[PDB]
Amino acid sequence: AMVIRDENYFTDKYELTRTHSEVLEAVKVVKPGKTLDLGCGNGRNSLYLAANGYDVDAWDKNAMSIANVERIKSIENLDNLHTRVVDLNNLTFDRQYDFILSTVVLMFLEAKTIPGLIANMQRCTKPGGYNLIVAAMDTADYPCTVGFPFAFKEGELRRYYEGWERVKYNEDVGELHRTDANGNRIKLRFATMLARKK
Numbered sequence: 785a786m787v788i789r790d791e792n793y794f795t796d797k798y799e800l801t802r803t804h805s806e807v808l809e810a811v812k813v814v815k816p817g818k819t820l821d822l823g824c825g826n827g828r829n830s831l832y833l834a835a836n837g838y839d840v841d842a843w844d845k846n847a848m849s850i851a852n853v854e855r856i857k858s859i860e861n862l863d864n865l866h867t868r869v870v871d872l873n874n875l876t877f878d879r880q881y882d883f884i885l886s887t888v889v890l891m892f893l894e895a896k897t898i899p900g901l902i903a904n905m906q907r908c909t910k911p912g913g914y915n916l917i918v919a920a921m922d923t924a925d926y927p928c929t930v931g932f933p934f935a936f937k938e939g940e941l942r943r944y945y946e947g948w949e950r951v952k953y954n955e956d957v958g959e960l961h962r963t964d965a966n967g968n969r970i971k972l973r974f975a976t977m978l979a980r981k982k
C-alpha cells in the first residue's frame with residue numbers, strides 16, 4: 785500500500801547511485817509526460833521517473849545495464865518503462881517527447897554525432913517540453929585530458945539552445961568519480977542545462 789517512490793527507493797533496494805540531483809530538481813517544474821532517457825545506464829533516472837508517472841524510453845548501449853533495468857522493471861511492474869539496447873552514434877529517432885534527458889553521456893560519443901543528435905532531440909521535443917543535459921567540457925582553465933571523444937566548448941551548449949528558455953544553464957566545475965595520479969577526484973567543467981522549448 786506504500787506508494788511513495790522517492791530518491792531512496794531504487795537507490796536502496798537495488799544499490800543504484802542515487803537519482804541525479806538535476807533530475808530531482810527538474811521534476812519540480814517538468815510535469816509527468818512522455819520521456820526519453822538517452823544513455824540510461826542502470827536506470828536510476830528512468831526508474832525514478834517511470835515510478836512517478838512519466839512514460840519513459842530508456843536507451844543505452846550496455847546490454848548488461850539494460851538487462852538490469854529490465855529485471856528491476858519486472859520486479860516493480862513498471863509497465864510505462866521501455867528499454868532498448870542502442871548505439872547513440874548510429875541512431876535516429878522520431879517520436880514527440882515532453883522531456884528528453886541525457887545525463888553524463890554525451891562525452892562518450894563521437895564528436896561527429898553531437899550536432900545531429902542535439903538537432904534530433906530538439907526536433908523531437910514538444911513545444912513547452914524540456915531537455916535536460918549534463919556533459920563534460922574542455923576549456924582553457926579545465927582541459928579535458930580524460931580521453932572522452934567529445935566535450936563541449938565554453939558556450940557551446942548555450943549556443944545549441946539559443947532559442948530556448950534556459951531555466952538553468954551553467955558551466956560549473958564538477959568532479960569525476962575517477963581519480964588522478966594522487967587519488968584526487970578529477971576536476972572538469974560540466975555544461976548543465978535545463979531548457980524549455982518555446
Ligand SMILES: Nc1ncnc2c1ncn2[C@@H]1O[C@H](CSCC[C@H](N)C(=O)O)[C@@H](O)[C@H]1O
Binds near residue numbers: 823825870
Ligand atoms: N555510443 C553509445 N550509445 C548509447 N549509450 C552509450 C554510448 N556510449 C556510452 N553510452 C552510455 O552512457 C552511459 C554513461 S553513464 C551515465 C548513465 C545515466 N545517464 C546516469 O545518469 O546514471 C552508460 O550507460 C553508457 O553505456
